[PDB]
Amino acid sequence: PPGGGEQEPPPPPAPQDVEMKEEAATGGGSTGEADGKTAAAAAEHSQRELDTVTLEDIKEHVKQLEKAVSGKEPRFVLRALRMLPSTSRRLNHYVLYKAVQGFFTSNNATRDFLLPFLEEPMDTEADLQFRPRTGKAASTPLLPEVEAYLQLLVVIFMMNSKRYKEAQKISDDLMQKISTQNRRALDLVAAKCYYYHARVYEFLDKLDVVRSFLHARLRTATLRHDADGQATLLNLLLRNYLHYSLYDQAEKLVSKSVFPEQANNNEWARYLYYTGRIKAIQLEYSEARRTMTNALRKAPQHTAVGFKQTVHKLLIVVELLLGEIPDRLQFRQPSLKRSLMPYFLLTQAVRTGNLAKFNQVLDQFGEKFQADGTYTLIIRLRHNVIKTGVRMISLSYSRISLADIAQKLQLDSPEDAEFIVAKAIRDGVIEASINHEKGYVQSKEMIDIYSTREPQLAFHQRISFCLDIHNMSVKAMRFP
Amino acid sequence: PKNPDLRIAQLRFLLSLPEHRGDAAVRDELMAAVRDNNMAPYYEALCKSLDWQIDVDLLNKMKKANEDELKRLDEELEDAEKNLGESEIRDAMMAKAEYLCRIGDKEGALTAFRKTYDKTVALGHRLDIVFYLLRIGLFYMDNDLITRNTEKAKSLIEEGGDWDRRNRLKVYQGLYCVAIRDFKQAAELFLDTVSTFTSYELMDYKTFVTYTVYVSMIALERPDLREKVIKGAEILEVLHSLPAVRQYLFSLYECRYSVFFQSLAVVEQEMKKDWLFAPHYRYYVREMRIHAYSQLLESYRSLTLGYMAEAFGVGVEFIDQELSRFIAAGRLHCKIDKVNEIVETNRPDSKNWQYQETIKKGDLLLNRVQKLSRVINM
Amino acid sequence: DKKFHGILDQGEGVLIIFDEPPVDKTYEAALETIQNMSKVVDSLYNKAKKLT
């Protein structure tokens, strides 16, 4: 008891230093940033706000409990108060509570006590200028609060937090609307909060009506005011719509637009991941391979953690259906390797020309594919395994017997030996000419057209890409 | 002052991969552990090997006697630094300081190295420090710091010119090129051959004969292969000493395909036990296959696999699937007629392969610069 | 020995000579990409210094 008793005092003041001055310098800086400049946006403290939310989300969040700093939840949500010249005295009151916690023990009030607390910005009457500062001061305890996952009686307080946030959203839609600039700082928050909507709804019930609300918001952004918001709303849509049948596939074509400009950076690329799986369901790989590859090269630098690895899990799927696949252990990660071991044996047996080798992996390792929902490829990949085997045997043998080729590929009968080749010629897989008497299959090697057509088609991508590098370099070079 | 520790790296690789050797591989390692008082090196091997029973006081009185031997030099410097001179103090401490870190880990070495780099006004002791980085680079198989100091030493060496240390570095870059996979640069840097003779950092010279001859059978073309062994006088005797290694060379020039399985058999058993070859040995297996198949298929335009059964004894379907997988890899294109037992050559590869290397490397290079281009900015 | 170019036949007893001498145009490109390796590698040091 003496040791732990003396180790209790030191921790609580560490946040009570940083977390006290954190949203006071960031929120209080964005307070003057919101009055003017306001160009664009920027509001560079909005990017700093991403960094701060992610800062507490590692350490120390809000609470707990901990029976020490749990009084910060009512502290920052109290005392607007009220107009800016009256806020000086309140900024001093925030510091008076430091001596209160230093003299006597700190008071903890959470859970049922949060109902009047969250209604105290409405009781103060009022902030009254900044809805995003009140949305941030109310959300900042609520957002890491989801990390409790107690699921009993405080989730309906998260529903009350969506209701209080909807009050702040009525105030977001009615107020301003001409050079709003509160919306552009709030669209990051409407993003995060709507993702927390779906997060909380995943633990109870999927949201059918909240998508009616979400689509009201979605379509209502265009054309009046959309900055960075609708790009996130479309990904909210796609996120549970990809998990929930159906039609959502062609839904994107009527939504686009694009929507430009792509934001926020990697946040657009992940959108390309979602639509990459979607466009994979239409079996078009050429459109799917580029959207998959762009997702990985457009996302730096991690950590964290496993979703950047999963996007790569589905990256090489479309390339495996293509028939041309690079060896995937060049992207091998110590945290990723352990996860795709069964998957890695899959691609290992896929690149081979043995059909039985491939059918064994589905039997033993299908249990993992059930969780990923990746069985959509396993039916259509067989076509690619047989096409791979026949490609090998085509280039590697001048003249092959159709009856003797069936034993190696376990083709089992003479009749399908003609069928594979028939569609092989139909798809341009092999140029060989086949004679049916016995029958036999002969093949010929033709070239010299070759470097006429193929390199110029590549050059069309090469040079255009190089001049695009030139344009992107000139753009960032002319700013000084 | 290296080979006693280098052979310890040999025995740690000998213990690590095979789990079937529980006797002669631990005995020689403890034989070298009771001496020189290696302390930190055996902890990593204690986790893999057995935990005994008892080490404890047996190695605790030795590490305390090593710390008394450590503190007696550390107690000699401040009586030595009272007087003063040029290097006579700081150089007196560093040698035994790197031996004291030879007892354990990388620490006392890494501090002593950056310590002495500001002391010596000549490359004599500098490159000796570099050699310490190379030997430790072999023990901990850490290739990070050995590529740097070597690049920095080549500039101080060639300002400039050298004999012994130059031909030493020629072998060092061969050890790094053989650690990773580089076949042409390894044999090129191995051109000094007997001029380095026996050296402690070069370990056994008889085994250096074998290492330098194992690379010459790949990246060296046949005219040049016999150009090195037949025309080179210094290398002609050492091969005459070992009849097993000589067998492979003269049988390779003799083109006899019956012995290649038996000779590569021995070469493969030695490839497994020796270190650094574990990653790279499986590529070598097929390397020598295509190198024999080259001279094979270049003689006759039409050939039958039934004739190959006579030289191979006896391949039927074996070489069928074999050659098929060599063709699928774009290695020595040849057109084989299935079920008709005919092989055709061709291949006038100077057309497509001439132009194919350009696309193969071009795609990888430009795909690299694509990532670097999108990095800046964000 | 490469001093002579062609191909033989054991069955028909036929030697055929064929030659396509020039290798220069590929050497052009090959020796380029090989050095451009160290080009990009050298760019990673500056790109790493500006960012961190």
């Binding site: 190089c466 960032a476 | 071009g362 430009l366 | -």
Partner: peptide, 30 residues
């Protein structure tokens, strides 16, 4: 190939030297 060879070099010198001369020169002024 030579085109794309020097295109990356132009972007190299330009972007590297300019981004440094942009943020590192502005940070000392303000």
């Amino acid at each position: 190939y030579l085109a794309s060879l020097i295109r990356s070099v132009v972007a190299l010198h330009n972007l590297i030297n300019n981004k440094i001369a942009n943020r590192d020169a502005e940070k000392k002024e303000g």
